[PDB]
Coordinates of C-alpha atoms in Angstrom, one line a residue:
Chain A
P211 CA -9.5 21.6 -29.0
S212 CA -6.2 21.1 -29.2
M213 CA -3.7 19.2 -31.4
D214 CA 0.4 18.3 -32.0
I215 CA 2.4 16.1 -33.6
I216 CA 5.6 14.4 -32.6
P217 CA 8.4 11.9 -34.4
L218 CA 9.3 8.7 -33.5
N219 CA 12.9 7.2 -32.6
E220 CA 12.8 3.9 -30.4
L221 CA 12.4 0.3 -32.3
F222 CA 10.7 -0.7 -28.6
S223 CA 10.8 -4.2 -27.7
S224 CA 7.9 -7.2 -27.2
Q225 CA 7.6 -7.2 -23.3
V226 CA 5.7 -3.5 -23.7
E227 CA 3.6 -4.2 -27.1
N228 CA 0.6 -4.6 -25.0
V229 CA -0.4 -0.6 -26.7
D230 CA -1.9 -0.4 -29.6
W231 CA 0.1 1.7 -31.2
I232 CA 3.1 0.2 -30.8
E233 CA 1.8 -2.7 -31.7
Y234 CA 0.4 -1.0 -34.8
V235 CA 3.8 0.1 -35.9
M236 CA 5.8 -2.9 -35.0
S237 CA 3.0 -5.2 -36.6
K238 CA 3.5 -2.7 -39.9
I239 CA 6.8 -2.9 -39.5
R240 CA 7.5 -7.0 -39.7
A241 CA 7.3 -6.9 -43.1
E242 CA 8.8 -3.9 -45.5
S243 CA 12.4 -4.3 -43.9
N244 CA 13.9 -1.1 -45.4
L245 CA 12.1 1.4 -42.9
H246 CA 12.3 1.1 -39.1
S247 CA 11.8 4.3 -37.5
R248 CA 11.6 8.2 -38.5
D249 CA 9.0 7.5 -40.7
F250 CA 5.9 6.4 -38.8
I251 CA 5.3 9.9 -36.6
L252 CA 2.7 10.0 -34.2
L253 CA 0.1 12.8 -33.5
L254 CA -1.7 13.1 -30.5
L255 CA -5.0 14.5 -30.4
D256 CA -6.8 15.3 -27.1
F257 CA -10.3 14.5 -26.5
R258 CA -12.3 16.4 -24.4
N259 CA -15.9 15.8 -23.3
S260 CA -18.6 19.1 -22.5
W261 CA -21.3 16.8 -21.2
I262 CA -22.4 15.2 -18.2
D263 CA -22.1 10.8 -18.7
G264 CA -19.1 8.9 -19.7
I265 CA -18.4 8.2 -23.8
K266 CA -16.7 5.4 -25.0
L267 CA -14.4 6.7 -27.9
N268 CA -13.1 4.4 -30.4
Chain B
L234 CA 57.2 12.9 10.6
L235 CA 57.3 9.8 8.9
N236 CA 53.9 9.6 7.2
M237 CA 51.7 12.7 5.8
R238 CA 48.0 12.3 6.6
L239 CA 45.1 14.3 5.6
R240 CA 41.2 13.7 5.8
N241 CA 39.0 15.4 2.8
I242 CA 35.5 15.4 3.6
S243 CA 32.4 16.0 1.1
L244 CA 29.0 17.5 1.5
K245 CA 26.3 14.8 -0.4
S246 CA 23.5 16.5 0.6
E247 CA 21.2 13.9 -0.8
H248 CA 22.4 11.5 1.9
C249 CA 25.2 11.1 5.1
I250 CA 28.2 12.9 4.5
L251 CA 31.1 11.5 3.6
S252 CA 34.8 12.3 4.7
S253 CA 38.1 10.2 4.0
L254 CA 41.1 10.3 5.8
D255 CA 44.2 9.6 3.4
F256 CA 47.9 8.2 4.5
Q257 CA 51.0 9.1 2.2
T258 CA 54.5 8.5 2.7
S259 CA 55.8 11.7 2.9
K260 CA 58.8 11.8 0.9
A261 CA 60.7 14.9 2.6
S262 CA 60.7 11.7 5.9
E263 CA 61.5 8.8 3.8
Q264 CA 64.9 9.7 2.1
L265 CA 66.1 10.2 5.6
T266 CA 65.9 6.8 6.4
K267 CA 66.5 5.4 2.4
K268 CA 69.8 7.0 2.9
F269 CA 70.3 4.5 6.3
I270 CA 68.6 2.0 4.6
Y271 CA 70.3 1.9 1.6
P272 CA 73.4 2.6 3.9
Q273 CA 72.7 -1.1 5.3
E274 CA 71.6 -2.7 2.3
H275 CA 68.3 -1.2 1.9
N276 CA 66.0 0.0 -1.1
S277 CA 62.5 1.1 0.2
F278 CA 60.8 1.4 4.1
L279 CA 59.0 -1.8 5.3
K280 CA 56.6 0.0 7.7
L281 CA 53.8 -1.7 9.5
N282 CA 50.3 -0.4 9.9
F283 CA 48.8 -2.4 12.0
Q284 CA 46.2 -0.4 14.4
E285 CA 44.2 1.8 12.4
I286 CA 41.3 2.8 14.1
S287 CA 38.7 6.7 13.7
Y288 CA 36.7 7.3 16.7
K289 CA 33.9 9.8 17.1
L290 CA 35.1 12.6 19.5
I291 CA 32.8 13.3 21.6
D292 CA 32.5 12.5 25.8
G293 CA 33.4 9.0 24.7
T294 CA 32.1 7.5 21.0
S295 CA 34.0 5.8 18.1
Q296 CA 32.9 4.6 14.7
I297 CA 33.5 2.3 12.0
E298 CA 34.7 3.1 8.7
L299 CA 32.8 2.3 5.2
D300 CA 34.5 -0.8 4.3
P301 CA 36.8 -3.6 4.9
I302 CA 40.6 -2.8 6.4
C303 CA 43.6 -5.4 6.4
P304 CA 46.5 -5.3 8.5
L305 CA 49.0 -3.6 6.0
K306 CA 52.6 -2.9 5.3
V307 CA 53.6 -0.8 2.1
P308 CA 57.5 0.8 0.8
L309 CA 56.2 3.8 -0.4
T310 CA 52.6 4.4 -0.9
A311 CA 49.3 5.9 0.8
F312 CA 46.0 4.2 1.3
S313 CA 42.9 6.1 1.8
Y314 CA 39.8 4.8 4.2
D315 CA 36.3 6.7 4.2
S316 CA 34.0 6.5 7.0
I317 CA 30.2 8.3 7.0
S318 CA 29.4 11.1 9.2
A319 CA 25.8 11.8 10.5
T320 CA 24.6 14.9 7.7
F321 CA 24.0 18.0 10.2
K322 CA 20.8 20.3 10.0
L323 CA 22.4 23.6 11.1
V324 CA 25.6 24.5 13.5
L325 CA 27.2 21.6 15.0
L326 CA 30.6 21.1 14.0
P327 CA 31.7 17.0 14.9
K328 CA 35.2 16.2 15.8
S329 CA 37.2 12.7 15.8
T330 CA 40.0 11.4 16.7
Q331 CA 42.1 9.1 14.1
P332 CA 44.4 7.0 15.7
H333 CA 47.2 5.1 13.7
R334 CA 50.0 2.2 14.9
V335 CA 52.8 2.6 12.3
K336 CA 55.2 0.0 13.1
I337 CA 58.5 -0.1 11.9
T338 CA 61.0 -3.0 11.3
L339 CA 64.7 -4.2 10.4
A340 CA 66.5 -7.5 9.7
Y341 CA 63.9 -9.8 11.6
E342 CA 63.9 -7.5 14.5
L343 CA 64.3 -4.0 16.1
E344 CA 61.0 -3.4 15.1
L345 CA 61.3 0.3 16.7
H346 CA 57.1 1.3 17.7
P347 CA 55.2 4.3 16.9
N348 CA 52.3 5.8 17.3
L349 CA 50.1 8.4 15.9
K350 CA 46.5 10.2 16.7
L351 CA 45.4 14.2 15.0
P352 CA 42.2 14.9 16.8
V353 CA 40.5 17.7 14.8
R354 CA 36.5 18.8 14.0
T355 CA 35.5 16.8 11.2
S356 CA 33.6 19.8 9.2
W357 CA 35.4 20.7 5.6
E358 CA 31.9 22.3 4.8
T359 CA 33.4 23.5 1.6
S360 CA 14.2 18.4 -3.5
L361 CA 11.5 21.0 -2.8
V362 CA 11.2 23.5 -5.7
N363 CA 9.9 27.1 -4.0
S364 CA 7.3 28.9 -6.2
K365 CA 9.6 32.0 -5.4
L366 CA 6.0 34.0 -5.0
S367 CA 4.1 33.0 -2.6
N368 CA 5.8 30.0 -0.9
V369 CA 3.7 27.5 -3.6
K370 CA 5.5 24.9 -2.7
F371 CA 5.9 21.3 -4.5
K372 CA 7.9 18.7 -4.2
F373 CA 7.2 15.5 -6.4
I374 CA 6.7 12.3 -3.6
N375 CA 8.5 10.1 -5.5
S376 CA 11.2 12.7 -7.2
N377 CA 14.9 10.9 -9.2
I378 CA 13.4 6.4 -8.8
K379 CA 11.9 6.1 -11.7
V380 CA 13.3 3.1 -14.5
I381 CA 10.7 3.0 -17.0
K382 CA 10.8 0.9 -19.8
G383 CA 9.4 2.9 -22.2
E384 CA 5.8 2.1 -20.4
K385 CA 3.7 4.2 -18.7
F386 CA 4.4 5.8 -15.9
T387 CA 2.8 8.1 -12.8
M388 CA 4.4 10.6 -10.7
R389 CA 3.1 13.1 -7.2
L390 CA 3.3 16.5 -7.8
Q391 CA 2.7 17.2 -4.3
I392 CA 1.6 21.2 -4.3
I393 CA 1.7 22.2 -0.8
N394 CA -0.2 26.1 -0.6
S395 CA -1.0 28.8 1.4
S396 CA -4.2 27.0 2.1
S397 CA -6.1 30.4 0.2
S398 CA -7.4 29.9 -3.0
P399 CA -6.3 26.9 -3.2
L400 CA -7.6 25.6 -7.1
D401 CA -5.6 27.9 -9.8
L402 CA -3.0 26.5 -12.1
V403 CA -2.9 24.0 -15.0
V404 CA 0.1 22.0 -16.1
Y405 CA 2.0 21.5 -19.3
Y406 CA 4.5 20.3 -21.0
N407 CA 6.0 22.3 -24.2
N408 CA 6.8 19.4 -26.7
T409 CA 8.2 22.3 -29.3
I410 CA 12.1 22.7 -29.6
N411 CA 13.2 25.9 -28.1
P412 CA 14.6 28.2 -30.3
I413 CA 18.3 28.7 -29.1
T414 CA 31.1 27.3 -31.2
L415 CA 29.2 25.6 -33.9
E416 CA 29.0 22.6 -31.9
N417 CA 27.9 24.8 -29.1
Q418 CA 25.0 25.3 -31.3
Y419 CA 24.8 21.6 -32.2
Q420 CA 25.1 20.2 -28.3
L421 CA 22.6 22.9 -27.3
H422 CA 20.2 21.6 -30.2
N423 CA 20.9 18.3 -29.7
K424 CA 19.6 18.8 -25.7
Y425 CA 16.3 20.9 -26.8
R426 CA 15.6 18.0 -29.4
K427 CA 15.6 15.5 -26.7
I428 CA 13.9 17.4 -24.2
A429 CA 11.4 18.3 -26.7
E430 CA 10.6 15.1 -27.9
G431 CA 11.4 12.5 -25.5
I432 CA 7.9 12.2 -23.3
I433 CA 4.7 12.7 -23.7
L434 CA 2.8 13.5 -20.2
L435 CA -1.0 11.8 -21.2
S436 CA -2.5 14.4 -19.0
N437 CA -1.2 17.8 -20.9
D438 CA -3.5 20.5 -20.0
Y439 CA -4.8 18.9 -16.6
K440 CA -6.2 22.5 -14.8
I441 CA -5.5 21.1 -11.2
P442 CA -7.8 22.3 -8.8
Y443 CA -3.4 19.0 -3.2
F444 CA -2.1 15.6 -5.7
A445 CA -1.4 15.1 -9.4
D446 CA -0.5 11.8 -11.1
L447 CA 0.4 12.9 -14.5
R448 CA 0.4 9.8 -16.6
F449 CA 3.9 10.2 -19.3
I450 CA 4.6 7.8 -21.5
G451 CA 8.3 8.2 -22.5
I452 CA 9.2 7.4 -25.9
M453 CA 12.8 7.6 -26.2
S454 CA 16.0 5.8 -24.3
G455 CA 18.5 8.2 -22.1
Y456 CA 19.4 9.5 -18.4
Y457 CA 16.4 12.7 -18.8
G458 CA 17.8 14.3 -15.5
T459 CA 16.1 17.6 -14.6
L460 CA 12.9 17.0 -16.0
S461 CA 12.5 20.4 -18.2
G462 CA 9.8 21.5 -19.8
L463 CA 7.2 20.6 -17.6
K464 CA 6.0 23.5 -16.0
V465 CA 3.0 25.0 -14.5
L466 CA 1.3 29.0 -14.8
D467 CA -1.1 30.5 -12.3
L468 CA -3.9 32.7 -11.7
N469 CA -1.0 35.7 -11.9
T470 CA 0.4 37.5 -15.3
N471 CA 3.3 34.3 -16.3
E472 CA 3.8 32.0 -13.4
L473 CA 5.7 30.2 -15.9
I474 CA 7.5 28.7 -13.1
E475 CA 9.3 25.1 -13.2
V476 CA 9.9 21.9 -11.6
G477 CA 13.5 21.4 -11.9
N478 CA 13.0 18.2 -11.0
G479 CA 12.7 14.5 -11.0
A480 CA 14.6 12.2 -13.0
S481 CA 13.8 8.9 -15.2
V482 CA 16.3 6.3 -17.0
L483 CA 14.4 5.1 -19.4
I484 CA 16.4 2.0 -19.9
Chain C
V297 CA -21.6 -3.0 -1.8
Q298 CA -21.7 -6.2 -0.1
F299 CA -24.3 -7.5 2.5
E300 CA -23.7 -10.2 4.5
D301 CA -24.5 -13.2 1.8
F302 CA -25.9 -11.0 -1.2
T303 CA -22.6 -9.2 -3.1
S304 CA -24.3 -6.7 -5.7
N305 CA -22.8 -5.7 -9.3
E306 CA -20.3 -3.3 -9.9
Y307 CA -21.6 0.0 -10.8
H308 CA -20.0 3.2 -12.2
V309 CA -20.4 6.8 -10.0
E310 CA -18.8 9.1 -12.3
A311 CA -18.0 12.8 -10.6
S312 CA -20.5 14.1 -8.7
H313 CA -23.6 12.0 -9.1
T314 CA -25.9 9.7 -6.9
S315 CA -26.5 5.7 -7.8
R316 CA -28.9 4.1 -5.8
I317 CA -28.1 1.0 -5.5
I318 CA -30.7 -1.3 -4.0
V319 CA -30.1 -3.8 -1.6
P320 CA -32.4 -6.8 -0.3
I321 CA -32.6 -7.4 3.2
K322 CA -35.5 -9.8 5.2
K323 CA -37.7 -8.3 8.2
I324 CA -36.1 -9.0 11.7
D325 CA -38.6 -10.7 13.7
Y326 CA -39.8 -9.0 17.3
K327 CA -40.7 -12.5 19.2
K328 CA -37.0 -14.5 18.6
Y329 CA -34.8 -11.2 19.8
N330 CA -35.3 -8.5 22.1
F331 CA -35.3 -5.1 21.6
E332 CA -35.8 -3.7 25.2
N333 CA -32.4 -3.3 26.7
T334 CA -31.0 -0.4 27.1
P335 CA -27.4 0.3 25.4
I336 CA -24.5 0.2 27.3
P337 CA -22.2 3.0 27.7
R338 CA -18.4 2.4 27.1
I339 CA -17.2 3.9 30.4
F340 CA -17.8 2.9 33.9
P341 CA -16.6 5.3 35.9
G342 CA -18.8 8.5 35.6
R343 CA -22.1 8.6 37.2
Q344 CA -23.2 10.0 33.8
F345 CA -26.1 12.2 35.6
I346 CA -27.6 8.9 36.5
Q347 CA -31.0 10.9 37.2
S348 CA -31.6 10.3 33.2
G349 CA -34.3 12.3 31.6
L350 CA -36.7 10.4 30.0
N351 CA -39.8 8.5 30.7
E352 CA -40.7 5.3 30.4
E353 CA -42.4 4.8 26.7
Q354 CA -39.6 7.6 24.7
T355 CA -36.6 5.7 26.2

């Protein structure tokens, strides 16, 4: 029940490359050596649970 | 009347009080003895400072200045050593002693010995964010301490209430560029763009019902002083008050 | 939950729920033990109303 979209500017580093989206954008930019950033914008979904147990959410 | 001395004290409020004395050469006294020195064929003076000491004036006390000092001797110069005080709460103006020992010089003899001591009071005297309504004081339990490396991290907004309906309010970050001498337009645009796009706040409308964790990720570098954007909002009309506090370098 | 040698699994209680963790234990042998001695007080100072208002079997 909300939504927000945020651009991207930092190339990042290899020692932090363990959360899913930064290793996705780095892995996508290992090839195609004209783009670096400012073209891989980042949208912020916010899931909310109106129920009574945990869910696993891929 | 050979070496003018002054003490400057600066009030570092997040630490001790810092006060530094400063020796100088006193030019209106140097041309005096320069006249008789070049009468005796000497270009500049050779005053030797052999025992310089600041003592904490009390019934009896003494301190030690916050770096190292040798036994030095200079011609036409100025030196300034710094000693750390203790940052008082309210209304106790401390005093110091500041003794010194200038030893003059002549042709390998006739060292006319001098000494001086000017005792005076060392009080020049020129992070809780209060709610400004009902003393709902906020303080981060680790403010101004964060060397992140574009990783996740957690902070702690320890809210302190009246303990009278203590479940009221919601945080949020407002990732939106605020809508604002043409380079005064551009510096405000770069400030408002790097504020509203550099960090994310992974728990957005967290709706706190008295600690919090507030995980961020922080996707651009640079020293973010004062961490703006991170507003709260409360049961009344608009308690849109800031935190105004906490900082993080991100490299 | 750790017993003296029984170690349970890793459950997950979410926010306000109950989750009955079931623990085994053997019985305690009556002839091997003694269960008819008075539980001691910490102090040895007060008289503690030494005329204790209790019978034999209730004690």
